[PDB]
Design a protein around this ligand. Sequence first.
Ligand SMILES: N=C(N)NCC(=O)O
Ligand SMILES: [Cl-]
Lengths: 521, 118, 107
Amino acid sequence: AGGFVGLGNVWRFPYLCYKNGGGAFLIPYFIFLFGSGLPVFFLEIIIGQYTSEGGITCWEKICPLFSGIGYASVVIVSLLNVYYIVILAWATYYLFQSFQKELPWAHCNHSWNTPHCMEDTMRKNTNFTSPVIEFWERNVLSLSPGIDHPGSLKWDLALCLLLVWLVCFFCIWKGVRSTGKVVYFTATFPFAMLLVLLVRGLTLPGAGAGIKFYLYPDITRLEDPQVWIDAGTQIFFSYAICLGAMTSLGSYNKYHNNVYRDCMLLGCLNSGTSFVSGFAIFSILGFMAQEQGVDIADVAESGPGLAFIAYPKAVTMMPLPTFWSILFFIMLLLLGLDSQFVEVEGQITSLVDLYPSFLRKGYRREIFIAFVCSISYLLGLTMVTEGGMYVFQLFDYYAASGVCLLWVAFFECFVIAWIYGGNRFSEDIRDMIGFPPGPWMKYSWAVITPVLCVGCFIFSLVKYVPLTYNKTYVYPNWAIGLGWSLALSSMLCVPLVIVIRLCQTEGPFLVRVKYLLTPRE
Amino acid sequence: EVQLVESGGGLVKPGGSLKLSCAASGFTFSSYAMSWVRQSPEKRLEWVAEISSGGRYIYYSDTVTGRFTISRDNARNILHLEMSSLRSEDTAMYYCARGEVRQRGFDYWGQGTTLTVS
Amino acid sequence: ENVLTQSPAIMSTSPGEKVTMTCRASSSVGSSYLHWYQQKSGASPKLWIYSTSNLASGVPARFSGSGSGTSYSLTISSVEAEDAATYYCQQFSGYPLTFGSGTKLEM
Ligand SMILES: N=C(N)NCC(=O)O
Ligand SMILES: [Cl-]
């Protein structure tokens, strides 16, 4: 299935790895991968099949009290769909800029370029700046000095967001998806371009340095909480778990297949292509270090812009750079567009199933899809302004990643493992797929996953360190509060639902608890 | 898993009722699904019913869907099969088998008890 | 019910000679959901082959299994004196479980 490769792999993993110093990210990344990553991904898919309904309705058949998990999930996809599409706007802008005789980021001789620029080759023939980096910052981004200075709304980027959103609306409205012969090209094209990029990176005259930085752990980094949540939550983000889409995916259709084998096959492959595409990014960074005569830790931005700094450099050192630059962004667009369709479609399905009486009562569903895209487009405008990067960084860290995913993951395992009961869950899976989860799955939900999620959460709070764009910009206090509001918007679902249903139920307290703990309500 | 032993077999008449039992030992009876298999005097094997590990899912053969009731006692580690409308064709030897994993089949079989409805 | 039919009900065999019995299903059966059981005269059946290719704990490597979809069979490299027994094919894909007619090796 195409949704198990995406911008989480080719854009999110390399930047987080680079931000956390590289090889020290891989220790907590693998620990969560098997400890919680795969076991939770199997858990969600079973829930969807077991009920054969949306991510919100299923919990009614498992533990009515904790139905808020479904609400917590649907809000997460709503926030994710707002800022994830912004990456397609940057790719769209790059693609149009690629339709030129010479790529603008190859050299710095234009009006938007600083007087401090020095070409990489001549930089080692001061506080010089590479043309590639400042093209991203000044031309594509026009970075503001801080989040407190929104600046002007970039009209060019606003049109790019409109173009991608329009494509999403028509595709969703008309149900356009890869089902025919085009599936071979759509699925194969990401891996074909990534192999060429990977080969280009390794063959660079300084690839070796980058791959050592990528793989050798600085174990003194593991004494900081940041790398544990960043690594652990990246597993949840990249698997699209805790979003409720996987529950909807299972309910859509599943039969005559071993779900256990499929989930491990999908989950190992999704993680493999992140690790594999890590070499490509770091290999390029290694070469940029020696060419620029600076540390590998400082060559590029320690943020979402890494993918828009490294890969554009790689395409510049290939025969006919324009040809490969075009192919890259029509692979960053198609790989990200298919993902956007799945989560926009899932969000629409999740929302209509709550109020089918009015929205799903007729043709209003078409109007609802336009409304969802419209409001999302307006929300995305905040991240298109000159200071939009700080908003985008804030959204990525908090809106649909970080503690919020841990919050959802902990309750999902806890409810099934202890409240619903592990034995009953294993009993269900026996009926569905014929064999029990086994000790690895049973203990992971019961012990490993709750402990890891809880441990990271406490370890963060005890050793709290505030978010910072790149590695030098400190967010203001109000900005941090806004970020926590986005994360709390999903976490607060579970407690809010619990109290609402405890109040909306008749009888003494204990009767209400017993009634809402028993499934099938 | 070492021992599975059936008991309770005997002679009855048409339209009668009987309760078959199968004690289990050597393994955690609660965590393994149990099934009943029937072997007619012609040596033909016929499936009767199966009960999940926890007893929440119970299934019956078409011939005994509305006549036989399957139950288990996890605390006592004993498997029970109840017949209420035994017919003339119900005479056979009954075996209790462990069927936890569908992809692996019945790992172990009991000694079995003969039932006749003469 | 997913009726399972075994063609060679009776197979007279001499020691050393290889034999093979074919089990046919009236409906689609998964590869992992078909198993073979051996039953010796006056004894309860014992699992022999599962997943259509995997040998049980006690069955020697002498036996092997093959098949998929709607036709399944197992073969014996060299029938020994201890191989004289009745073999039944069973399907687990559908829940109204059905056992094959059974093929009895009389020698
Ligand atoms: N949209 C998601 N939640 N995941 C896609 C990815 O793997 O980046
Ligand atoms: Cl990943």
